Amino acid sequence: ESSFMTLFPKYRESYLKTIWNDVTRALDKHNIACVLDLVEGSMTVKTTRKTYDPAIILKARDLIKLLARSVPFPQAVKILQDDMACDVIKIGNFVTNKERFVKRRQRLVGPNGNTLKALELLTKCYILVQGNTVSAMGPFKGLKEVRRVVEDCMKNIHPIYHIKELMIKRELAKR
Amino acid sequence: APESVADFERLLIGNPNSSVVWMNYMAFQLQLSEIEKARELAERALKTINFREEAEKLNIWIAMLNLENTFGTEETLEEVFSRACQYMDSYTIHTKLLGIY
Amino acid sequence: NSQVFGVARIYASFNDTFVHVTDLSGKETIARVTGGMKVKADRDESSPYAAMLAAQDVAAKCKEVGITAVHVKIRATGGTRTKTPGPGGQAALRALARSGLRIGRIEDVTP
Amino acid sequence: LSSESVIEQIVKYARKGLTPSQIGVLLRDAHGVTQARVITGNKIMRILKSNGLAPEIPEDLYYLIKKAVSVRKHLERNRKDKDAKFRLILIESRIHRLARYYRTVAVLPPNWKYESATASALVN
RNA sequence: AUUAAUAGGGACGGUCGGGGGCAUCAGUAUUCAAUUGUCAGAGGUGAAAUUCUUGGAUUUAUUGAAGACUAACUACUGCGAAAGCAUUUGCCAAGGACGUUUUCAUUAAUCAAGAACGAAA
């Protein structure tokens, strides 16, 4: 039937194997077939005829990619609920060489993780930087600022422009 | 003028970078109904001329194509086309070919 | 079982929810029920609750015509867009399943 | 092992149309010999010069002067070959220092004037 | 012929690279056109506005034409003189590391002047 597959690096599969038995313990509650292909290093979210709706497989397919993007499986666990949707942004096509790509990588993170946690307190999302992705998960009116911050900061734009608009909109919130 | 088999060949020792002699020699060779000595001449003037002369080198591919325009073949003018497309520019020989066609 | 089925294209994008379940061939969709038609504020087009209200009409027009099953070809934006599945997926596809319409060999077939 | 016979093997090998490294690579592969510096007591290029089998240009230079003219053929195929012309500016500095060695160490005269124009005449 | 700087050129052979020039074929993604089913919205926004819309906006599917790039695999991975660099495969020429009791014996080190490549517009 349905199947959505995602490949993983070496960093999360060992972290998956402590939770993939819990993933199959949790996917069985919605009757979804989860594969732990240790030979392939990939997981596939498959549908079953004992399930209610096929939409929860794709919501777990975002959770399986969140499980494969070195985000926590507890942090990927809330995606199966209604009012929490993820945003697995690929930011690979920004700079070819590793020099200027790593220049904007820490600038989207900041010194001691303050600026990466700043957008977490600005746009209300779980920002997860692992490898060449910037994954977020939250309300879409807050998550619209997440894709606006992630797509422009891999270019020559800094997060100081993003946070200052976010600090102004948060201050005029209570009115 | 150079009108013999020995005449235009002697000028090649004095004028190596001159394809204009082979441009008249290919008019002097294929006029005797044997263009195999004229197709040899455009092949010889490629390996005899200096590589720094681009005005005669691209014209050498334009000479063997315009000779191929009336007195050539179907795939022989195209095999000389993709040989000029590797040794020289693509569309500048094709804009020459658009004027030739 | 008799396989009274078509194909269901649900556009669960980031800005709206458009549902156009097609036939066994790609043309001649028997149903086309928008999410912004069942809620009139121009802001609830991406809401799944308006998409769940829209999904009752989506099951209705096929059950009126004769398609008792629908295989889901789910759609996010894809391509040169945000490429991720939005909010309108988990409610609109479930309400077709809550209406007894048989799901089987479902897919996400966006760009 | 009859020391002059390795020279008589070289006297046919230098007459076989090969470089001095080619006589040293072949004799060390199929004849057991170590080098020209071995007990026979004569250099590979100097024994070829002593019997009239030496070349016209230096073997250090003539394989580099040929490599300067041959690499210009790809640059004659594309003037946008920005690395092959960069290799051509470098390799023409490799043969120029070689001929400047022979001009001072009296293997070539100081009026030779090595140029990439006539280097196709000294490669063939 | 004082030695063959565990200096250097040059030569062989096993390797390798997202190197570059050319070519090969493969890949998704986009626009426009031909056209069917159907519409009260579609897009955009914090809420709107703006934009197209029984001129069918909009969704699906199909065909044609054109332009760009190699996501996940894929990374502190190698390479390119630097700039820069990712489908399959080749042509041509260039290159890191390799071993020779292979060849030369300083041919070798920094570069004003002066010239070549070349990041944005």
**Can you tell me the CATH superfamily of chain C?**
Ribosomal protein S11/S14
Main beta sheet of chain A: 3 strands, antiparallel
Question: Largest sheet of chain C at a glance?
Answer: 5 strands, mixed
The computed structural class of chain C is: alpha/beta
Distance between the termini of chain A: 52 Å
Strand order of the largest sheet of chain C: 3-2-1-4-5
What is Rg of chain C?
Answer: 13 Å
* Overall CATH architecture of chain C: 2-Layer Sandwich
H/E series of chain C: EEEHEHE
The residue fraction in helices of chain C comes out at: 10-25%
Q: Provide the CATH topology of chain C.
A: Nucleotidyltransferase, domain 5
Per DSSP, the total helix count of chain C is 2
Subcellular location (chain D): Cytoplasm
Keywords (chain D): Cytoplasm, Isopeptide bond, Phosphoprotein, Ribonucleoprotein, Ribosomal protein, Ubl conjugation
Modified residues (Phosphoserine) (chain D): 5
GO molecular function (chain D): small ribosomal subunit rRNA binding; structural constituent of ribosome
Detail the topology: elements first, then pairings:
The structure is cut from a larger assembly and holds chains A (175 residues), B (101 residues), C (111 residues) and D (124 residues).
Chain A: E1 3-7, H1 10-17, H2 20-27, E2 32-34, E3 42-47, H3 55-68, E4 85-90, H4 99-107, H5 114-120, E5 128-129, E6 133-138, H6 140-153, H7 159-171
Antiparallel strand pairs in A: 1-3, 2-3, 4-6, 5-6
Chain B: H1 7-14, H2 19-29, H3 36-48, H4 54-71, H5 76-79, H6 81-87, H7 91-100
Chain C: E1 5-12, E2 17-22, E3 33-34, H1 48-65, E4 69-75, H2 92-98, E5 107-108
Helix pairs in contact in C: 1-2
Chain D binds one RNA strand of 121 nucleotides through α2, α3, α4 and α5.
Please characterize this protein's 3D structure.
The structure is cut from a larger assembly and holds chains A (175 residues), B (101 residues), C (111 residues) and D (124 residues). With 101 residues, chain B is mainly α. In chain B, 70% of the residues lie in helices and 0% in strands. Chain B is built from seven helices and no strands. Chain B is globular, with a radius of gyration of 13 Å. Chain B starts with 6 loop residues before the first helix and ends with a helix. Chain C is of the alpha/beta class and 111 residues long. Helices cover 23% and strands 23% of the residues of chain C. Chain C has a five-stranded mixed beta sheet with strand order 3-2-1-4-5, covered by helices on one side. In chain C, helix 1 crosses helix 2 (92-98). Chain D has two domains: 1-54, no CATH class; 55-124, S15/NS1, RNA-binding (Helix Hairpins, Orthogonal Bundle), CATH 1.10.287.10. Helices cover 59% and strands 0% of the residues of chain D. Chain D has helices at 4-13, 20-30, 44-50, 59-77, 84-104, 119-123. The chains are: A alpha+beta (175), B mainly alpha (101), C alpha/beta (111), D mainly alpha (124). The B-D interface holds B 51, 54, 86-87 and D 72-73, 76-79. The structure holds one RNA strand of 121 nucleotides.
